RNA sequence: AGCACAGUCUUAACGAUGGAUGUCUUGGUUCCUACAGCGAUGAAGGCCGCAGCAAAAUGCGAUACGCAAUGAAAAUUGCAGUGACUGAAUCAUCAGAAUGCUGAAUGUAAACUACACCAAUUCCCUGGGAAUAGUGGUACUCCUACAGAAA
RNA sequence: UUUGUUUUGUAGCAAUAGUAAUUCGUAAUUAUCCGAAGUGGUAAGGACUAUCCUUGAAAAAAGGAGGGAACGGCUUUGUGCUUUGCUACUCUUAAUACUUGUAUG
RNA sequence: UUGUGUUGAAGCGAAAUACGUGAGUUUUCGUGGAACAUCUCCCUAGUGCAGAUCUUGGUGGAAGUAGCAACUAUUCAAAUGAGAACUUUGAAGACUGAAGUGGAGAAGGGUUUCUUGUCAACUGUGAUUGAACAAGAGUUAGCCGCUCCUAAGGGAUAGCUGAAAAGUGUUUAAAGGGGUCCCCGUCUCAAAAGGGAAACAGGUUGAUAUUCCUGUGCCAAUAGUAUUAUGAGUUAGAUGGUAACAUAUAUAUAAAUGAACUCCUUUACAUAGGCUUUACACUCGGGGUGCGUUUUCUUUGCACUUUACCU
RNA sequence: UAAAGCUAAAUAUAUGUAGGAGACCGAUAGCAAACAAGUACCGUGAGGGAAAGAUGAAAUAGUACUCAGGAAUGAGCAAU
RNA sequence: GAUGUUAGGAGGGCAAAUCCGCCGAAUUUAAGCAUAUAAUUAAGCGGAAGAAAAGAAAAUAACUAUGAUUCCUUUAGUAACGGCGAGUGAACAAGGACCAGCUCAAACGGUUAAUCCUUCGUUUGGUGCAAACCUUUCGACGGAAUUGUCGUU
């Protein structure tokens, strides 16, 4: 016989993902000693449409506290968070929709 | 249909494959993936074969010009030593 | 097509100049001539 | 009608004037090419091979201008050094090909290989 | 490395080789007073003229190139109002 | 000026078509003999050029169907023109000079004659005049030295 | 210095270029060039509405900003700093002319 | 071994009161114009053709036959020429017909382009024609494109595998810039329809034109000083508006400071539907400039009147 | 006397080059190629790949002249 | 170690008939075919020379013994291997061509690293018209080397 079709996929010449139009891995912040020992809140500027994924994501941005600067991070948005919203990550951070905590 | 297996379809025959190959000269530079059918040039190596002794031989070593070697020719004999000139008159 | 490049222009030149017969001074002490419809020089 | 050894040894200066302008006066040879008239054009080969003969011995005479200052030194340039092939310049010397260590030197040295006879 | 001959990179002598004497070369002398010349092609434009203004005195409202078919280059050349381009041509021929 | 029927078939003589046969052979083939590599000092190969008229093949490389030198030794010739009356016309040899763009190709590229960086470079006379948008160097790996930084 | 009423202009190029009719050495002047509109054929723009379990590129390049390292001169003291007298001043656009390679393409 | 050849060898065509039984052999005539035998005996082999849908080449009957059938369609006169249904000119009859055998178009072609000459072959009839043949000539850009950017993606670097060939491409970047130590940071290629510095009109050639010429512009670039001006702001920087808003008309409306660091915006984006604006397109009647049936009617049928880039 | 190393001769050479030969082939043969042959030409490409020698001693004897034809050509009382 | 637009150098590619490593078939034969054979071949990858490779016994022999390697004659289609089928298949001695043998690894210089390389200068004389080349040696400098070069076998 031939390579059957389900063998054929794993080659990954026309059964890449179709990702050109992505908008980013959503992706939490990287473990820091601010996430770590308190909370740091950042701002959902806007929500976006990623068009693989059915779930909205969250444009958040982070105050960086090592440097001057922002830092833009690609979230999946709960059900409920909205544009303007602050939104805290670490141990202390509040129990609330959308914060990050430890589990 | 009407541009059928055959003429239809040897209506379609624009743009090409290949190309002039500046290490060979020949018509045979594959565009898309940029490597000749014929020597391989981006390759270091020639690209011969021993299942072809054509092609062996109609690109072998003295089908050329050799502008080199032809002249380094017929020096053996002679066994001149650099720089040396014939006696003056 | 009008847009080509220089070597390939070069080449075409060299081609139709190729083309000439062989002299009249000469023949009086040629086989590679092409015609653009008929023989096509394959660049 | 030019020769050899009459801008064989000629002043530099005047070499280059009469061949700055002699190519001017080859390019007025070729207005009345391009023109009708062609009567002028047997003796483009002497003068082509006039200015190879004195170039021949001017480029020569260039490297004897320009060799002069680097003669000898033992870090002769690329081109100065000698041109056998690769494999004789990349070859053992014959000073070191033969080069014999102490001991089988004061072997043959002391104990050569000689003639003898059988009668 | 020391080279010893000199250098073979092409002055006027070489890159300009001749005039031409086509019709067209002639008429728009005639006509509106623009001129055309040949040369090597490994020239460019300012290669080129420098020699207008090099073997001549005639100023350059401009140069301009073309590659022909034959291995050459053909140029062109202009003048301005302080010159007339007629005895550009008497004197040339 | 007169006569044959036509066609088809057969025979002979002479022709047409064709290129067999014979005879030629600056070719091939096989054997024997001898020498043997070339290349970053840029090879093989590929392009592009070079002749007064010049397409191919052959030869050659901006000195471009050939330069210099050496031996023989005076034509080149299709026309032209150039040559002594032997470094001159042509052969042969070929050591000197020169050897375009590429190509292992090696600054980055390449269906680009595109783009860099560093010495602005090179020529003239033996310190003063010019050419100029115009020369060389700069791959990767490794070896021997050297260097200033490091834990 | 404002508002209204009258005269010039095919709003400013613009007619003189282009086009056009009758004469006229074989070269010219001539005169017009006007009021308006009507259909929506094709393009583009605009403000909208709707659709998606489809949300419909990137970079070169350019701009704006927050912030506040540095901001008036001549000469004079000691060591970029206090200081003594006078205060005319500084940039933006266009260049003018000498100097580096020749300073456009 | 021993012969024939320019006083004509081999070969070839026709033949012979020739010999053999036969493969053949030997002669004659013609042609041929240079070599040829040996049967005296033997040695040797790529040594004998009617076939193999045999190989190569040449040639037949078929046969002056099939056929020269899409695309409605040609006609009269003249010129050239040896020669004209298919070359040119004039008249007519028609066609393409707004989705065109029309202008510009890319890919592909490569001189087929232009002028002149020309007809050996080709142009399946003719041919004086021609995309054929021959000799010359012709393609002009700061503004049109490539060149630059990045995409789907390709090659390569470090590594890591593999005998290598090759596979993959950060899998422990000690990897180029900025400003003045720090910050940032794989390289390279991939679009002549994506992104993008800046041009229009008129004219010109046998053949090129938003490239040449005339005029008018636009964009990018431009090293150190002494002069000028303009406008501003100033002895380190304005204006009003209850407001939105706006704010410098010198040649041009430039003239309201600014580092490191950082945050935005433009580039920059789907489809459908209608509404609207404007330019172009077309059209309408009476004004300025020409042709016509009219045995019969006519303010009569119709026809020629513009404005780029630049504010 | 292993788990280290070098070494010239006699040996082989369908390659390249240069010589010399043959009970070899004699242009459908012999190399594919006696010649402008790995050429013309075909295939996108890897590749495939021909045909084609002979006047004469001398063209430094290659057809002068005439006639008929537009010319090609033909004919001759003409010519190598 | 990292890094050098530091100084001096090497490798890359072509070419293969002979030669040296790797990798590696099937057609075929067996009248089928699977081990076997084709074949340790063809194709593929890499590496040298005028030759290469092998080569100076951890070798044969069993004799009155030979003495590096290679090649020729022979052993020999033999010993042996094998659906013991088809097929495959050496070695020793013997006769010849040729015939050269050697050095690293430990000891001692430790009353003197005694060794090696780089660079820069002088000169011992010379064949060559020349260009260049063969010889020449006082050195000095800078290193390498004691984690071992040479003297010593």
Same mark, same amino acid.
Do not use: M, Q, Y
């Given at each position: 016989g031939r390579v059957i079709r389900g063998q054929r996929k794993?080659?990954?010449?026309?059964?890449?993902?179709?990702? $050109? $139009?992505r908008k980013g891995a959503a992706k939490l912040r990287h473990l820091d000693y601010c996430e770590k020992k308190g909370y740091i809140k950042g701002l959902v500027k806007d929500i976006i449409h990623d068009?693989?994924?059915?779930a909205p994501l969250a444009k958040v941005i982070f105050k960086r506290t090592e440097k001057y600067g922002k830092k833009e991070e690609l979230i999946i948005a709960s059900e409920g968070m909205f544009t303007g919203q602050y939104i805290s990550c670490g @141990?202390?951070?509040?129990?609330?929709?959308?914060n990050i905590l430890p589990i | 249909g009407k541009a059928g297996k055959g003429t239809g379809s040897f209506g379609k025959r624009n743009g090409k494959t290949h190309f002039l190959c500046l290490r060979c000269g020949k018509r045979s530079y594959h565009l898309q993936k940029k490597k000749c059918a014929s020597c391989g040039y981006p390759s270091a190596k020639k690209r011969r074969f021993n299942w072809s002794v054509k092609a062996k031989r109609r690109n072998t070593? =003295? @089908?050329?010009?050799?502008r080199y070697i032809k002249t380094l020719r017929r020096k053996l004999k002679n066994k001149f030593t650099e720089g040396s000139t014939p006696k003056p008159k | 097509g009008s847009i080509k490049r220089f070597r390939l222009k070069q080449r075409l030149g060299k081609c139709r100049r190729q083309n000439r017969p062989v002299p009249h001074w000469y023949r009086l002490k040629n086989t590679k001539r092409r015609h653009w419809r008929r023989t096509k020089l394959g660049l | 009608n030019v020769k050899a050894y009459? /801008?064989? @040894?000629?002043?530099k200066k005047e070499l280059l004037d009469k061949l700055d302008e002699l190519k001017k006066e080859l390019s007025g040879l070729r207005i009345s090419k391009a023109l =009708?008239?062609?009567? &002028?054009?047997? &003796?483009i080969h002497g003068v082509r091979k006039n200015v190879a003969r004195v170039l021949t011995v001017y480029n020569q005479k260039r490297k004897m201008e320009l060799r002069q200052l680097y003669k000898? &030194?033992?870090? &002769?340039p690329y081109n100065l050094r000698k041109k056998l092939t690769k494999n004789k310049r990349l070859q053992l010397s014959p000073k070191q090909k033969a080069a014999m260590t102490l001991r089988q030197k004061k072997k043959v040295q002391n104990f050569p290989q000689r003639k003898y006879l059988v009668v | 490395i020391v080279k010893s001959c000199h250098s073979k990179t092409l002055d006027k002598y070489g890159l300009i080789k001749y005039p031409l004497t086509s019709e067209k070369a002639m008429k728009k002398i005639e006509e509106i007073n623009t001129l055309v010349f040949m040369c090597d092609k490994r020239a460019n434009k300012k290669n080129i003229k420098k020699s207008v203004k090099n073997l001549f005195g005639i100023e350059c409202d401009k140069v301009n190139v073309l590659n022909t078919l034959n291995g050459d280059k053909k140029a062109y050349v202009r003048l301005s =109002?302080?010159?007339?381009? /007629?005895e550009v041509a008497n004197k040339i021929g």
């Open positions: 794993g080659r990954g010449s026309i059964f890449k993902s179709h990702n $050109h $139009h068009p693989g994924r059915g @141990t202390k951070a509040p129990l609330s929709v959308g | 070593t =003295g @089908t050329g010009r050799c | - | 009459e /801008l064989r @040894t000629l002043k =009708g008239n062609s009567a &002028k054009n047997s &003796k000898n &030194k033992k870090f &002769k | =109002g302080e010159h007339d381009a /007629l």
